[PDB]
Write a protein that binds this DNA or RNA. Structure first.
Lengths: 61, 64, 64, 62
DNA sequence: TCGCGCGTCGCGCG
DNA sequence: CCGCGCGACGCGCG
């Protein structure tokens, strides 16, 4: 998918143990946050992304 | 100056030259409430160290 | 807006006294998206016009 | 709500065509101004209070 | 033209 | 124990 790959490549250009927030990616890609989270949690359903607790939640691998 | 000032200053510097960011962003990356960040941000602008461009939210960068 | 506020308040009136209904129910009866239904519900609660009871889903009744 | 009554009764005692400021209500009632305003704008939500422009804004009963 | 109310928001939910 | 309202907000204020 489109958002899926954008979000993946971005994370790789951040680091391995590095994680970011949805809101961050929302402004770093100019796409609505409700949308980022939708694709974030979706990528989780595929084992491509790992979510780590917090408010807001953090996203990596 | 204080701890918060130095912290925010080194942060903005390590972004480039004509780069900017928001209080919200700093609040998250410094693990500090946003009211405090804004307290220091506007204070630094009063010392000519920081420059603020309009917007909602406002953007912040090093003063030229 | 204050249109829905009436459609709902009126629907809640006929519901009797002390009888609470859900947002999902209203969504059907009023042919309105649950989201807009909830927006107005929580808004009215703030206006002290509506009272909300715990549960899943939450129940809604005329306040006081 | 506990505050809403206090503020209302005061604006009732004030007068119909009369308007006071949040900064004043804060002083009379001994309530931090933030709370006064917090309630003021809330009461304006419920159509109980009417706000008319100015710096500071003026407040009266609907 | 100090006006200020302002809290959190975590939300992924189909 | 799907609960979801969620956007307004720019706020720094002594």
């Amino acid at each position: 998918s489109h958002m899926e790959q954008r979000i993946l490549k971005f994370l790789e250009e951040l680091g391995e143990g590095k994680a970011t927030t949805a809101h961050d990616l929302s402004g770093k890609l100019g796409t609505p946050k409700k949308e980022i989270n939708r694709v974030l949690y979706s990528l989780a359903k595929k084992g491509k992304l790992q979510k780590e607790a917090g408010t807001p939640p953090l996203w990596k691998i």
